[PDB]
Amino acid sequence: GSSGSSGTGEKPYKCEECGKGFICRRDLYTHHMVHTGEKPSGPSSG
Ligand SMILES: [Zn+2]
């Protein structure tokens, strides 16, 4: 779907939660931690 053409470099593993690119699949997962702790109780208001 999304536009995909040869040009700029894109990380092989990107967070599907926020959209952070990483050169290592391991690192990405680690960051996923901050995602497993949502805060539905705050001004977040979505
Ligand atoms: Zn993320």
Distance 11 CA to ligand 1 centre (A): 14
Structure method: NMR
Rama region for 17: left / alpha / beta (φ>0; ψ in -120 to 50; rest): alpha
Largest Cα–Cα separation, the chain: 43
Q: And the tokens for 8? A: 């700029």
Which domains does the chain carry?
11-46 (3.30.160.60)
* 44: phi then psi, degrees, rounded to nearest 5: -35, -45
CA dihedral (31, 32, 37, 40) positive or negative: positive
Instruction: Please choose, from the candidates 1, 27, 24, the residue with its C-alpha nearest in 3D space to the C-alpha of residue 12.
Output: 24
**HEC string of 1-46?**
CCCCCCCCCCCCEECCCCCCEECCHHHHHHHHHHHCCCCCCCCCCC
Instruction: Please choose, from the candidates 36, 9, 10, the residue with its C-alpha nearest in 3D space to the C-alpha of residue 21.
Output: 10
Distance 2 CA to ligand 1 centre (A): 19
Instruction: Please choose, from the candidates 39, 1, 44, 38, the residue with its C-alpha nearest in 3D space to the C-alpha of residue 17.
Output: 38
* 22: phi then psi, degrees, rounded to nearest 5: -140, 145
